Symmetry: D2
Subunit: 115 residues, 4 copies
Amino acid sequence: CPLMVKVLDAVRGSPAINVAMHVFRKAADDTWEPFASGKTSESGELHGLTTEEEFVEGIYKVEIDTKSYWKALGISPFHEHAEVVFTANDSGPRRYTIAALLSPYSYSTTAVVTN
Amino acid sequence: CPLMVKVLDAVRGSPAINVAMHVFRKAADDTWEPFASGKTSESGELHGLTTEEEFVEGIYKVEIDTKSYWKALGISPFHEHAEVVFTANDSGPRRYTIAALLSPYSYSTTAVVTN
Amino acid sequence: CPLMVKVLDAVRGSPAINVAMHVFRKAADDTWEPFASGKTSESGELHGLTTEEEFVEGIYKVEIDTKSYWKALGISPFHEHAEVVFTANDSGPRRYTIAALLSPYSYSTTAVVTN
Amino acid sequence: CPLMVKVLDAVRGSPAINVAMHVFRKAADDTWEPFASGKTSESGELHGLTTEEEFVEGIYKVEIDTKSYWKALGISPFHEHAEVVFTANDSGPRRYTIAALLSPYSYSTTAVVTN
Ligand SMILES: Cc1nc(Nc2ncc(C(=O)Nc3c(C)cccc3Cl)s2)cc(N2CCN(CCO)CC2)n1
Ligand SMILES: Cc1nc(Nc2ncc(C(=O)Nc3c(C)cccc3Cl)s2)cc(N2CCN(CCO)CC2)n1
């Protein structure tokens, strides 16, 4: 599994469950093409987005729908979504774990890249 | 000044100086119209992006060129840029400060919304 | 002002106002000697903690009473306090700004060290 | 396993391996008594610190030796250590995952608490 995303809720101290996200890949014409999508599990994780064969070199964007998450909890947040844009597999295949920590007016994101 | 951006460097413990960013406003056709841009000062701040009259409600995107910043320091970064996407809403006199804390493989962003 | 503290609230998107904190200096017997204290202002800042003459090299601890802050807002917090422990070192004229971003189950802290 | 700690390196985008930490519990005389200690594995995780029976109600402090970690990588960091102080099991047994994200001049910590 070369691309996993983990989302945490900093207000409740819990995984962020049922968080939708869409992954896009930059096409040769500079447009964002849809690549994969899903929602986080009870553990706040989203696995199985892609495979090593499909996950070629490129610029990828993960758009995490944080706004819908907060609204469902009764909170009007600042951000429309959290966005994570990165070049992947530029030096050969890697495994990427994208983590996001969510608050109503703030978010942090980090990446762990393993060979 | 209805919109200010402050950028900090978590590796050097300093303001992030000379960081370029562009601000976009979402158009009716769902495309990003360039709105304002600049580079952070020696204090890591960028002021004078817009005026109260021009800064109407809508969806705005601040795209911070973090990749060029880390490249200038000789440090290999993860992200292509840091993106802050938010809805501006008229609820009394509001001033927006977008703060961003930068590390090579991570970034955090917060909004301070005051009167 | 060789030492300033700025505290932000990631739930409300605002400075964290009226947050009490104590600063300690580590003594030879490895105990924490009270050094300075105060409460953050309406801008979430606390100035005037020490002077250049008094702020000698050593190990310092800033203990931020985040628990009382969240209790005042009716929000159940995780941490008893936020602690920032650091060595102050004389390498040219240096001013320290300790920034802290608060959520109920998370906090981040950064140091901005300038001349 | 009721207490686990996970540490990430935001400069390298990797687990923070071989990070020492000590856990203390506040005694009835208001002193910090040693409770458990260990170092993070190749995955940046520390498991097996305690058991449900031993991990009684109390105020606990996790002191993560971040300074030694950065110095071994050739970096002189700001903080002496990262400190996480919290009341545990106040409403009955819980499982606590403490996460820390490390940069030379900044750290963030969060907690996931599960029943
Ligand atoms: C050193 C400094 N820091 C400022 N503000 C902030 N510092 C840090 C911020 C912040 O949130 N950090 C952060 C953290 C800690 C964790 C995760 C993510 C993040 Cl992003 S916000 C403002 C400031 N000023 C000087 C005085 N000017 C007078 C104008 O009248 C005002 C502006 N100087
Ligand atoms: C690299 C990695 N990180 C994991 N957990 C966390 N990553 C980051 C965490 C976190 O909170 N970051 C953070 C952020 C984002 C901001 C501020 C502050 C912080 Cl601290 S917590 C889990 C994990 N797994 C690999 C796949 N395994 C099998 C599938 O279940 C087990 C899970 N891999």
